[PDB]
Nucleic acid binder design. Structure first.
Ligand SMILES: [Zn+2]
Lengths: 378, 150, 121, 90, 286, 242, 204
RNA sequence: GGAAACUCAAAGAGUGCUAUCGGAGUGCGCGAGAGCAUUUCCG
RNA sequence: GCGAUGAUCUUGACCCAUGGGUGGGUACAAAUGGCAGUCUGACAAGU
RNA sequence: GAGUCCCAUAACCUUUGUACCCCAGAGUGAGAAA
């Protein structure tokens, strides 16, 4: 009496009619419990008769949570109301081979005419359908099981932990590891703008040494033909007169054109990169103020991002001890005991703003006042 | 190429075997039950009188198969060895041979003491190091290499 | 559901901190949060105690993630000044640890305390 | 590669005769046939470690042969042991 | 899983006979899809009825053992439960008929003051039953008339009787002369078969629920399987480690006979000693 | 010794997936799945391959991981092959599951279960990096409430710290482990029974396994790395136990 | 970069996607992946910051396309015989490896052949092996057309004609930059290649 | 001596592959047939 | 009007009255600096 | 005739610049001040 089976799967619910029966008395024998392993005899024993996939991802998570606490839900109750026949009271009531005794009473409460069962026969029949997996379903689906169960597992784990997805330190990690490399890339490509515009105007590297305003005035003057407009160079940059008369006295000059046009394209794009740096630094300034405010107020924003980058993650920094927050360069006798004090106060602030749910600034401020009193001790 | 030399099991000394704490686990076997009966000593009270400590006896499925296999002369032995005071192991190997079942069982654990009486099993047990055998003798038991008999 | 969940009541508090004072007189105790986490990620720690009223609670709440990962019991105690008086030191210590040592004469009381607090958690 | 580049012909002989490289080590006996699939790596230190397992940049040589030549105590032991061996052979 | 649900120190002396029941109380619903009821009579004058917690189903979530204890004047020698309406009969000094709503016996049904070794109800036309007493005698009884109805006397004492679950008026009879007789009820002058292959006392018999095979188990250390329509042994099981098989029963699957020796074990056997139990492909079954 | 910058050869080992890193002093090393980031602070070998690519390797610190000590003491065969699916009862944090993950590789999966919460959020924050693992934050004593999301693993491994070790692994292996599949458990003697000593509690646990139909085949003690644990390797027979 | 510029967050991915990118069979995969995804959510601050990152990284790719097209046009301007024979993305590596155009023209056909793989050359010379034969000319369009050791023979003859064309259009000071002896040498290399691949060393 | 396997033969292992009178009516069974069977519309 | 929320600390060696130089490390960047030198050279294919 | 196939589109070393630093180290762990 096992004639219907219910299997739950991370794409949908399945219900199997049990065609013939398993040998109950000899159900520990080798020649019976190898039939569950091989496939040519399991489909003699179990056929698919219904498979309704929940299609919403959040509805899959909700079905998984209701099964994991052992409670019926809409899709499960729907397919059992569809598939399970009303066994009339003259014959019997229908039986259903479900996987767990925690689920059992909650379907017996809702359907009276069903009767759940999980002995070792239902256990190893569900084990057999779990082992054979996709090859039972004979193509009534769109999507394999393992990627769907990967997503459903990660979602079920985060819904159990109720993990705060606003405590985001990986953003600050990638922000500072992009910021320093992007400063290096702006400097290298601006050296290429200098070395490429030297052939057209080599007395500009002496006058205008700043990379960004060099690139912007290279975007301004195309060829050496300006000679008059003095009232735009203090805007784009006194030295206006030096670059204007050096635009006719110098003449270390190649007169080339298409390369000057691509120099112009390169220079305006390097200026765009400088604008991107000048906004991303401010972005991680305020994101350092949001994520890690006590350590931000104590040590500074970019020094804090460098320190969390050296640690690897904020949680790893916090579970580091307070003497292994030795990092070279950052936290710049009487020159060393102040750095040790600042080190373990930085570890204290790291503990506060990581293990809080969402942190404040008052402890960063009183930490700043404590370390400033320790500095004025000198 | 995987060689396999078993390490000397790290709850053993040179030959002191500090893993045998006084609540003992003994391994009863077949002719030891038979000689216990035909010397008319008891089992649990006899072991307590020989060792001055609480002993938990064990019989394996191989030894129970031997005791069933030896026919109806030792129905007294089988009724005695189905005692609810003893426990029971569960072997998994081919061939119900009490000798190599016992000596394998004890040389991969070094914590059981072996309550035997036949010559070949006593020879193999006292050949391998640092497990104590006991045996019937006179009207009591006798221990061979326990470090604190008294 | 607060952030200092295994908070010990009164009688268990008194027995764990007289075990603390016996350990401090037997030279088997580490006093303070960062030496506690140093001996914790070194591994020698029978169990660790925190104080549930330090003015930032997170400066010792960083110890759960180490200790229940490295499988060692941990207990909150409702008074840092009582734990300081227990450790036998002037300033209030907020996070103590008991090192592991099988050559110390309080092994029985340490194991009784550890069994009681594993049943508590 | 089949020509073996001679550097991973040097240092494989080095780690095969590793047992006589410093007279305070005493590696356990093993034959060590050369593997026919093997690479050459470089230990990236931990960023949270310094002063105890970090080699200086002027000392990270291209192979462990030049790394073993780079210090002083190994050279002292090698010169005195090798000279005593030549004197014992003569 | 070949394991035990619960154990009970059920009595003091020898246990004599047990059977299971789905005992319909009148002040209680039959909760027989979550716990299962067995009752057992011994020779220390007690007949105990017990519940058993059983995970055959998983409907619910505790009343483990000793639901009640009927106690009798004389000793008790065997029982069997009438499978309808929660009635059960015992044997002892004389046969008694109880139901589970009374501590006292409802009826007393002997011929004379002679003890009764074993009983058995039917499997259909349930209101009649048979028994065997140590006057070497087979008695029948009918609860519809509430009286004994006929009595034959053989040449040796009948140990165990067993009805047929497909004929409803044939039974087998296992006695100490080494042959299991097979009687027709409504003409008890001729044992219409005699299965005649043992060497010692025929300690128990049972019909398979397919209705044509007989399992028997002898006082000598062997069991035999017969067919009904032949009268000699189909085949024989034995092992070195069983002595004096005292109780054999077919299972309801009609393929597995449960034998129980005197050594202590309850062994199992395939009836067909070569048909395996896996579901086979259709060319293999052909 | 073994400072940051030395050149170490990377020889393969018997257990496919792991590698021996032979320098002037030897290491045990697994090939890293997500390159560029250590997970619990271990040192990383970094080899170059020829379009120049660069792949990295992690060391396996046996004093802080369980089965690394069994590997270095020398087990006859594990079941953690480079293709299998591996269940991990008592996944504490990334500190061993990352090693079992990158032993398993990009095809097989590692289902890592965990009962506590704060190691759970650490496990999830590690688990977003490499994709071949599934973090589950459920109790290992109830394999019927994460039966929804896993299926038919090919070897289980066990580090849980409860005195119903055998019942945990027996229920999880009946519910999930396939037939003829491996089960590698790691018993801690002082954890599961403090009264009687190590060999007695190991023999009692391995007897509970061979009652729960796992046929054991290897017992290792891992003494120079941890004290009085043991690795017990077994197969799950279910058919022809003897 | 274009799909992060189009989606932004993964929640907007179901109701839209372009079909100019990810042609017709990766679209439903990325939509179902954004449905069942395992990463977390980010807000609009870091969303528009990585959006500006995607802007800069798509501008880098369009600028690399424009600059390689520029390199083709400019090499066709300066040394049209060499890039009419060999190819621009090989002549550029040749010139920028050897330094000046004149100090590449002052070099024989053998080193114009083996100008790339000099480290395998010198280790093969200082041990006892056999020196290589393609080097940097292997990525040209004609030694890939040849098959077998015919690419070795064609690498030598194309290095010789590269020397001819290269030092002509590096040393002449009156050329019209039409590539005349360039495509003449291309025709000679091509029918040399054809009449050497047309042999069949299998005895028919 | 190296072997092209594309000449064919005998065999050995590993892998994948399937099931067990016709619609109503009419005496009929607890909104209801899974069947007993026809001179009723019949076909 | 100190300190476990962490006190204390096991000094890179020379020229002058605790303060004035060579040597080191840690990061990038450049080099027409080095390692570092650009293969063979008259036959081959087809009948 | 003749190794593109371990990035000479490079690696390493040295020098030169630039910015920082010149404390034990899986730091120790209970005293300083008068
Ligand atoms: Zn055995």
């Amino acid at each position: 009496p096992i004639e219907y089976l219910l299997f739950e799967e991370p794409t949908g619910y399945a219900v199997f009619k049990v065609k013939l029966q398993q040998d109950d008395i000899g159900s520990r024998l080798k020649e019976v419990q190898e039939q569950i392993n091989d496939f040519g005899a399991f489909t003699k024993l179990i056929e698919l008769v219904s498979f309704a996939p929940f299609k919403g991802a959040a509805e899959a998570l909700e079905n998984a949570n209701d099964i994991s606490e052992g409670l019926v839900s809409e899709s499960l109750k729907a397919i059992l109301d569809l598939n399970l026949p009303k066994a009339s009271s003259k014959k019997k009531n229908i039986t259903l081979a479900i996987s767990d005794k925690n689920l059992g009473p909650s379907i017996k409460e809702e359907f009276p005419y069903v009767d759940c069962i999980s002995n070792e026969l239902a256990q190893d029949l569900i084990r057999g359908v779990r082992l054979h997996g996709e090859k039972l379903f004979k193509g009534l689906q769109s999507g394999d099981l393992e990627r769907a169960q990967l997503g459903l597992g990660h979602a079920y784990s985060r819904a159990k932990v109720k993990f705060s997805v606003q405590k985001n330190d990986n953003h600050i990690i990638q922000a500072i590891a992009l910021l320093d490399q992007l400063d290096k890339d702006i400097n290298t490509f601006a050296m290429r703008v200098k070395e490429w515009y030297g052939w057209h105007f080599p007395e500009l590297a002496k006058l205008v040494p700043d990379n960004y305003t060099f690139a912007k005035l290279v975007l301004f003057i195309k060829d050496k033909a300006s000679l008059n407009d003095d009232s735009l160079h203090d805007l784009a940059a006194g030295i206006a007169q030096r670059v204007i008369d050096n635009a006719r006295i110098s003449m270390g000059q190649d007169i080339s054109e298409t390369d000057m046009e691509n120099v112009c394209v390169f220079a305006q794009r390097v200026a765009s990169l400088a604008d991107y740096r000048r906004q991303l630094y401010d972005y991680l300034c305020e994101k350092m103020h949001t994520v890690a405010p006590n350590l931000s107020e104590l040590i500074g924003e970019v020094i804090g991002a460098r320190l969390i980058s050296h640690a690897g993650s904020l949680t790893n920094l916090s579970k580091q001890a307070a003497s292994t927050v030795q990092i070279l360069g950052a936290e710049k006798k009487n020159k060393g005991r102040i750095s040790r004090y600042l080190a373990n106060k930085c570890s204290m602030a790291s503990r506060i703003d990581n293990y809080s749910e969402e942190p404040s600034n008052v402890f960063g401020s009183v930490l700043k006042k404590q370390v400033e009193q320790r500095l004025e001790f000198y | 190429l995987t060689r396999n030399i078993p390490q000397v099991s790290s709850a053993l000394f040179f030959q002191y075997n500090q893993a045998i704490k006084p609540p003992y686990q003994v391994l009863i076997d077949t002719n030891f039950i038979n000689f216990s009966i035909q010397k008319k000593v008891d089992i649990v009270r006899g072991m307590m009188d020989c060792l001055l400590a609480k002993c938990n006896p064990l019989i394996t499925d191989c030894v129970m198969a031997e005791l069933e296999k030896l026919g109806p002369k030792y129905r007294i032995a089988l009724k005695l060895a189905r005692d609810p005071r003893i426990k029971r192991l569960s072997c998994s190997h081919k061939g119900t041979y009490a000798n190599d079942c016992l000596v394998h069982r004890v040389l991969q654990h070094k914590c059981y003491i072996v309550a035997t009486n036949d010559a070949g099993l006593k020879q193999r047990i006292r050949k391998i190091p640092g497990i104590p055998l006991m045996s019937v003798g006179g009207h009591a038991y006798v221990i061979e290499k326990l470090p604190d008999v008294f | 559901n607060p952030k200092a969940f295994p908070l010990a009541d009164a009688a268990l508090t008194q027995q764990i901190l007289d075990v603390v004072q016996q350990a401090a007189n037997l030279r088997q105790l580490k006093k303070g949060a960062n030496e506690a986490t140093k001996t914790l990620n070194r591994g020698i720690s029978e169990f660790i105690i925190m104080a549930a009223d330090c003015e930032p609670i997170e400066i010792l709440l960083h110890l759960p993630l180490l200790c229940e990962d490295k499988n060692v019991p941990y207990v909150f105690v409702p008074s840092r000044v009582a734990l300081g008086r227990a450790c036998g030191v002037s300033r209030p210590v907020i996070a103590a640890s008991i090192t592991t040592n099988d050559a110390s004469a309080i092994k029985t009381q340490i194991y009784a305390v550890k069994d009681k607090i594993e049943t508590l958690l | 590669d089949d020509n073996m580049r001679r550097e991973v012909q040097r240092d494989l002989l080095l780690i095969k005769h590793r047992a006589a490289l410093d007279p305070k080590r005493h590696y356990k006996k093993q034959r060590w046939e050369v593997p026919e699939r093997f690479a050459i790596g470089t230990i990236i230190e931990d960023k949270s470690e310094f002063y105890s397992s970090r080699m200086n940049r002027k000392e990270r040589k291209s192979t462990i042969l030049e790394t073993l030549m780079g210090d002083e105590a190994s050279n002292k032991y090698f010169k005195r042991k090798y000279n005593e061996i030549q004197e014992k052979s003569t | 899983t070949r394991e035990e649900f619960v154990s009970f120190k059920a009595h003091y002396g020898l246990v004599t006979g047990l059977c299971v029941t789905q005992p319909r109380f009148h002040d209680k619903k039959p909760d027989l899809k979550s716990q299962n009821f067995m009752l057992s009579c011994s020779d220390d004058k007690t007949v105990k009825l017990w519940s058993i917690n059983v995970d055959d189903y998983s409907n619910k979530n505790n009343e483990e053992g000793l639901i009640r204890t009927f106690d009798g004047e004389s000793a008790f020698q065997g029982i069997d439960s009438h499978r309808e309406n929660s009635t059960f009969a015992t044997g002892g000094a004389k046969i008694h008929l109880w139901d589970v709503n009374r501590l006292k016996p409802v009826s007393d049904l002997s011929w004379g003051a002679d003890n009764i070794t074993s009983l058995k109800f039917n499997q259909n036309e349930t209101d009649i039953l048979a028994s065997t007493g140590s006057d070497n005698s087979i008695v029948l009884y009918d609860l519809r008339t509430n009286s004994p109805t006929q009595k034959i006397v053989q040449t040796m004492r009948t140990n165990a009787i067993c009805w047929n679950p497909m004929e409803a008026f044939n039974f087998v009879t296992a006695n100490e002369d080494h042959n299991a007789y097979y009687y027709d009820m409504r003409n008890l002058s001729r044992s219409l078969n005699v299965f005649k292959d043992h060497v010692s006392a025929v300690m128990d018999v049972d019909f398979s629920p397919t209705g044509d095979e007989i399992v028997t188990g002898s006082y000598d250390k062997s069991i035999r399987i017969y067919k009904t329509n032949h009268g000699h042994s189909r085949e024989i099981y034995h092992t070195k480690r069983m002595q004096h098989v005292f109780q054999v029963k077919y299972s309801m699957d009609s393929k597995y006979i449960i034998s129980g020796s005197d050594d202590g074990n309850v062994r199992l056997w395939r009836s067909k000693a070569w048909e395996r139990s896996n579901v086979k492909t259709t060319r293999e079954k052909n | 010794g073994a400072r940051g910058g030395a050149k170490v050869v990377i020889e393969p080992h018997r257990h496919a997936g792991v590698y021996i890193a032979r320098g002037k002093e030897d290491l045990l090393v697994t090939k890293n799945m997500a390159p560029g980031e250590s997970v619990y602070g271990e040192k990383r070998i970094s080899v170059e391959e020829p379009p120049p690519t660069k792949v990295e390797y992690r060391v396996w610190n046996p004093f802080r991981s369980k089965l690394a000590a069994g590997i270095m003491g020398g087990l006859d065969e594990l079941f953690i092959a480079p293709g299998k699916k591996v269940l991990y009862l008592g996944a504490a944090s990334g500190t061993s599951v990352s090693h079992v993950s990158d032993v398993v590789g990009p095809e097989g999966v590692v289902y890592a279960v965990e009962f506590s919460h704060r190691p759970g959020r650490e496990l999830i924050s590690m688990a977003k990096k490499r994709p071949n693992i599934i973090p589950i934050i459920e109790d290992a004593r109830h394999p019927q409430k994460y039966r929804m999301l896993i299926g038919m693993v090919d070897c289980v491994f066990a580090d849980v710290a409860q005195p119903d070790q055998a019942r945990i692994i027996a229920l999880n292996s009946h519910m999930f482990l396939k037939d003829q599949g491996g089960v590698v458990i790691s018993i801690k003697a002082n954890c599961i029974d403090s009264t009687v000593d190590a060999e007695t509690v190991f023999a009692r646990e391995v007897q509970k396994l061979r009652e729960e139909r796992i046929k054991p085949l290897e017992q290792l003690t891992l003494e120079p790395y941890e004290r009085d644990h043991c690795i017990v390797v077994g197969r799950y027979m279910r058919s022809g136990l003897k | 970069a274009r799909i992060i510029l189009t989606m932004g967050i993964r929640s907007k991915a179901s109701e839209t996607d372009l079909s100019e990118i990810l042609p017709e069979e990766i679209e439903e995969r990325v939509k179902t992946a954004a449905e069942v995804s395992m990463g977390t959510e980010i807000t609009q601050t870091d969303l528009d910051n990585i959006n500006a990152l995607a802007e800069q990284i798509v501008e880098f790719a369009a600028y690399r396309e424009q600059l390689s097209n520029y390199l083709s046009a400019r090499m066709k301007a300066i040394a049209p015989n060499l890039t009419q024979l060999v190819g621009e993305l090989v002549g550029a590596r040749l010139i920028a490896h050897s330094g000046s155009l004149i100090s590449l023209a002052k070099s024989p056909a053998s080193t114009i052949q083996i100008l790339g793989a000099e480290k395998a050359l010198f280790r093969a010379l200082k041990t006892k092996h056999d020196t290589p034969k393609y080097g940097l000319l292997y990525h040209a369009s004609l030694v890939g057309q040849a098959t077998g050791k015919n690419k070795g023979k064609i690498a030598r003859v194309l290095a010789a004609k590269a020397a001819v064309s290269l030092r002509y259009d590096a040393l002449a000071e009156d050329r019209d930059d039409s590539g005349d002896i360039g495509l003449e040498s291309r025709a000679k290399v091509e029918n040399r290649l054809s009449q050497l691949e047309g042999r069949d060393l299998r005895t028919t």
